[PDB]
Amino acid sequence: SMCLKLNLLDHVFANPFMNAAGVLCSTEEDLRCMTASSSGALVSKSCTSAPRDGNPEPRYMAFPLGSINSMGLPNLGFDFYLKYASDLHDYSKKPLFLSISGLSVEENVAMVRRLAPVAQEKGVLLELNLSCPNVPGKPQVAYDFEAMRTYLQQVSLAYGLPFGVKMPPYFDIAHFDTAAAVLNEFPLVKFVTCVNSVGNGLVIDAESESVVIKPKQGFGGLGGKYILPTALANVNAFYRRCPDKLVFGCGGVYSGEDAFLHILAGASMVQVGTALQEEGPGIFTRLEDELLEIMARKGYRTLEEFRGRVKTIE
Amino acid sequence: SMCLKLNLLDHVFANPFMNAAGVLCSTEEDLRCMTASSSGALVSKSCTSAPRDGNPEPRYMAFPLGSINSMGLPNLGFDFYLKYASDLHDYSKKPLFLSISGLSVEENVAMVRRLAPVAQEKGVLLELNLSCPNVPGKPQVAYDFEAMRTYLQQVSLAYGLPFGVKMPPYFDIAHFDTAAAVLNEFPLVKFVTCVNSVGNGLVIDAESESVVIKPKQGFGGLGGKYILPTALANVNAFYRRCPDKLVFGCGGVYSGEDAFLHILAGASMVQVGTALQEEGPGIFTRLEDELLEIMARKGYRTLEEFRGRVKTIE
Ligand SMILES: Cc1cc2nc3c(=O)[nH]c(=O)nc-3n(C[C@H](O)[C@H](O)[C@H](O)COP(=O)(O)O)c2cc1C
Ligand SMILES: Cc1cc2nc3c(=O)[nH]c(=O)nc-3n(C[C@H](O)[C@H](O)[C@H](O)COP(=O)(O)O)c2cc1C
Ligand SMILES: COC(=O)c1cccc2cc(CCCCc3c(C(=O)O)[nH]c(=O)[nH]c3=O)ccc12
Ligand SMILES: COC(=O)c1cccc2cc(CCCCc3c(C(=O)O)[nH]c(=O)[nH]c3=O)ccc12
Ligand SMILES: C[As](C)(=O)[O-]
Ligand SMILES: C[As](C)(=O)[O-]
Ligand SMILES: C[As](C)(=O)[O-]
Ligand SMILES: C[As](C)(=O)[O-]
Numbered sequence: 341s342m343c344l345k346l347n348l349l350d351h352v353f354a355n356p357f358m359n360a361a362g363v364l365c366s367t368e369e370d371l372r373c374m375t376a377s378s379s380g381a382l383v384s385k386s387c388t389s390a391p392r393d394g395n396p397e398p399r400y401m402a403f404p405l406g407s408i409n410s411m412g413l414p415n416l417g418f419d420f421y422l423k424y425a426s427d428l429h430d431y432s433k434k435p436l437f438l439s440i441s442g443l444s445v446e447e448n449v450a451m452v453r454r455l456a457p458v459a460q461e462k463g464v465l466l467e468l469n470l471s472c473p474n475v476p477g478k479p480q481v482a483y484d485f486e487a488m489r490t491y492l493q494q495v496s497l498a499y500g501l502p503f504g505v506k507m508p509p510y511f512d513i514a515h516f517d518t519a520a521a522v523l524n525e526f527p528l529v530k531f532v533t534c535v536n537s538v539g540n541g542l543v544i545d546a547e548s549e550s551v552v553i554k555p556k557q558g559f560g561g562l563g564g565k566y567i568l569p570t571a572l573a574n575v576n577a578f579y580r581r582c583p584d585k586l587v588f589g590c591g592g593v594y595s596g597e598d599a600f601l602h603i604l605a606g607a608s609m610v611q612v613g614t615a616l617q618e619e620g621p622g623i624f625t626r627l628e629d630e631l632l633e634i635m636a637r638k639g640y641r642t643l644e645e646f647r648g649r650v651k652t653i654e
Numbered sequence: 655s656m657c658l659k660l661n662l663l664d665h666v667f668a669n670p671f672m673n674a675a676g677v678l679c680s681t682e683e684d685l686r687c688m689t690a691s692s693s694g695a696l697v698s699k700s701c702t703s704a705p706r707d708g709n710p711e712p713r714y715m716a717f718p719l720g721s722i723n724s725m726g727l728p729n730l731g732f733d734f735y736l737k738y739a740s741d742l743h744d745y746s747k748k749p750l751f752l753s754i755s756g757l758s759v760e761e762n763v764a765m766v767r768r769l770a771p772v773a774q775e776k777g778v779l780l781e782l783n784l785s786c787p788n789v790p791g792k793p794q795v796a797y798d799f800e801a802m803r804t805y806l807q808q809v810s811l812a813y814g815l816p817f818g819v820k821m822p823p824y825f826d827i828a829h830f831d832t833a834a835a836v837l838n839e840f841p842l843v844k845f846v847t848c849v850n851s852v853g854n855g856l857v858i859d860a861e862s863e864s865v866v867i868k869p870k871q872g873f874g875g876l877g878g879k880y881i882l883p884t885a886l887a888n889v890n891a892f893y894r895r896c897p898d899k900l901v902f903g904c905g906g907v908y909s910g911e912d913a914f915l916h917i918l919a920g921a922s923m924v925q926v927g928t929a930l931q932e933e934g935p936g937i938f939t940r941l942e943d944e945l946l947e948i949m950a951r952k953g954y955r956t957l958e959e960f961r962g963r964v965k966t967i968e
Contacts, residue, residue, distance in 0.1 A: 546948070
């Protein structure tokens with residue numbers, strides 16, 4: 341307890357919290373608001389080479405147990421996020437991650453060669469989003485393990501510097517084994533963020549008898565309380581499988597207790613999506629106070645004392 | 655006058671509600687208790703050829719948002735559930751489904767060959783569980799589409815009568831498309847039950863810093879409030895893709911409103927797992943009363959007036 345500062349990836353962080361990609365991070369105003377917050381770090385909205393308007397509205401809805409979204413990758417385009425990283429961000433305040441989600445391997449490769457020099461000069465960190473649009477006859481890249489191994493071979497070659505990868509959840513132990521083995525072929529992959537939204541849920545409103553988002557006939561990715569045990573399982577499964585990488589936890593964090601659980605499961609940073617969208621950036625002071633209170637009550641003075649130390653029975 | 659009656663698969667059901675396989679259905683006492691309840695049907699515990707003790711305890715835990723289990727297929731063996739179907743079940747009370755979950759294709763074929771004549775004579779209905787290991791280190795059967803196709807070819811040939819399948823949830827539209835395509839190759843697959851538990855979640859208790867079930871280092875399938883939007887998405891995705899089959903909904907039903915949503919999404923029968931494990935069989939009269947109250951408020955007199963009629967935006 342006392343202070344939550346930590347060191348990772350050759351950067352210093354005041355605390356393990358940050359936003360989850362896509363939440364409060366699309367515009368210059370959003371990035372400045374996350375920088376002014378008490379978060380330890382921030383990450384930009386996943387970007388494409390060109391600006392995109394994204395899907396028709398309504399495209400995000402939240403409820404007491406979490407959220408559903410089909411945003412459609414609305415973003416200001418890579419040139420904007422690169423300019424933010426290279427000219428506007430104040431690195432004295434906290435580290436910045438830039439998320440990129442190009443629609444093809446070649447788009448991703450082209451973005452990463454342009455990011456490399458700014459990464460070298462300013463220390464922006466890459467989070468590569470291994471999620472994708474629906475392509476009939478094909479699964480998202482992180483659910484096609486040979487495709488994933490390609491992206492990553494090309495990005496590693498094009499980029500040449502340490503980066504991390506945002507993963508969808510898996511639900512099968514054979515898939516954890518295969519996915520972690522792919523990631524462990526790439527020494528430049530230094531962190532793994534588990535998880536993106538739980539794909540293609542469906543929220544229906546009983547009174548109106550209607551789905552609640554317009555795109556994809558109401559289907560969208562789930563976040564929030566629905567997904568905490570899924571997120572913890574993925575964090576711990578990759579923590580156990582990838583001893584030479586860091587794991588960042590994302591999914592279902594509304595409280596310092598939920599962050600403590602992610603850290604027990606193995607998380608180094610803890611990302612906040614739905615709860616941050618719903619509460620606003622004040623949440624970061626509350627999460628830090630709540631995490632330090634649980635640490636004090638247990639006698640922990642550092643995150644290292646309990647990271648990955650979830651106990652199993654027998 | 656409003657009515658919850660259904661007539662499907664050559665049987666008559668007083669109402670759409672039944673247990674989910676595995677809950678309140680392992681012993682003769684459990685089956686007689688389900689038969690005495692107000693449910694419209696019941697299904698037996700997934701069985702294997704030989705009796706199994708299942709995994710060490712604790713292997714099921716529940717919490718306000720749902721449950722986690724790694725039961726390990728504990729069951730009295732096929733001969734016991736076939737005897738209950740042949741000799742003990744009172745068909746004048748309600749229809750019976752028998753769930754089978756052999757650990758290889760050959761074990762499944764051996765069971766269904768022996769079930770067939772009792773299905774024909776007594777009208778017990780088969781639910782084949784495809785959320786079930788085959789070769790260890792490979793995914794569960796229904797996440798391996800080639801294994802799925804083989805199981806269904808082999809069981810269709812061996813059994814020769816209408817049956818249904820219990821599916822795990824999917825999270826990728828390409829997987830909905832592929833999975834429904836595989837099902838639609840089999841005309842004897844007349845119902846599809848969506849969904850089994852969401853696989854390999856991990857619940858951690860913050861005070862003890864421990865996982866809450868003993869098998870698989872705490873990893874287990876999730877049911878209950880966590881999984882309702884996932885369940886609804888799978889029900890509706892298979893309802894849209896399998897127009898010549900029925901869909902039975904399972905996942906996250908605690909109220910008549912949750913059942914109404916399943917039915918809007920396309921469900922015929924509605925199965926209740928976690929909430930029945932937690933509340934007991936009195937839940938069925940509460941779910942019938944709650945569903946009738948929503949139907950009365952909306953002016954609906956039968957389930958067909960709204961099954962599959964979820965509205966999309968635009
Ligand atoms: C409105 C919204 C937009 C998101 N956009 C992205 C994104 O651009 N890139 C990405 O990696 N994940 C994105 N996500 C997923 C979140 O980063 C996060 O993985 C997910 O919401 C689970 O965390 P939570 O339970 O805290 O919400 C988005 C989530 C939401 C709710
Ligand atoms: C204790 C337990 C045992 C289960 N055993 C089986 C089983 O034998 N066969 C099966 O198809 N599903 C089994 N399941 C899954 C349930 O049938 C159901 O698909 C899942 O719990 C989701 O429904 P719910 O949200 O109502 O719990 C079991 C679930 C629980 C909680
Ligand atoms: C109906 O068409 C789409 O939804 C779509 C079209 C073209 C590109 C897409 C690209 C995506 C990629 C999603 C990547 C960003 C993201 C989003 C988001 O921007 O929707 N939401 C998340 O929960 N996680 C994410 O990682 C999703 C949908 C589309
Ligand atoms: C420790 O190793 C295991 O978990 C295991 C070992 C041998 C056979 C198994 C068989 C299963 C098969 C699951 C089939 C029944 C079932 C169960 C159950 O009995 O665990 N729970 C569910 O939520 N859904 C189900 O469909 C699961 C685990 C094992
Ligand atoms: C705060 As926004 C509307 O740019 O995510
Ligand atoms: C393990 As203790 C010293 O944190 O009470
Ligand atoms: C009620 As029981 C322990 O036979 O599922
Ligand atoms: C008219 As129909 C319920 O068989 O698709």
